[PDB]
Amino acid sequence: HAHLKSATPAADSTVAAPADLRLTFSEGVEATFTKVSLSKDGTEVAIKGLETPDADKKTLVVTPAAPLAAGNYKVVWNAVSVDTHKSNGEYSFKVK
Numbered sequence: 507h508a509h510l511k512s513a514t515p516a517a518d519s520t521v522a523a524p525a526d527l528r529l530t531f532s533e534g535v536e537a538t539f540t541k542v543s544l545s546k547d548g549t550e551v552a553i554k555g556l557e558t559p560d561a562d563k564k565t566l567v568v569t570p571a572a573p574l575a576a577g578n579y580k581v582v583w584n585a586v587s588v589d590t591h592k593s594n595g596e597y598s599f600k601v602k
């Protein structure tokens with residue numbers, strides 16, 4: 507099972523807008539089977555891509571279609587690990 511070890515931006519942090527979201531899991535994950543929702547102040551934000559760029563597949567990069575406006579963001583993820591298993595979670599962060 508892939509558990510979220512950390513993310514950038516971090517849960518409950520306030521940051522200047524990043525270029526992408528980066529979730530690091532306890533196990534490798536599969537970008538084709540994994541799903542991620544992003545919302546700002548309760549409104550869906552468009553995701554152009556998912557990818558795991560590294561050989562170990564532990565960091566999932568979530569690329570928004572456009573630059574991230576200031577606001578309160580919620581991330582919902584449903585992961586499929588290289589070990590086949592499902593996991594899911596949520597966290598929130600702020601773009602100042």
Ligand SMILES: [Cu+2]
Pocket residue numbers: 507508587589591
């Ligand atoms: Cu498992």
Ligand SMILES: [Y+3]
Pocket residue numbers: 550
């Ligand atoms: Y929609």
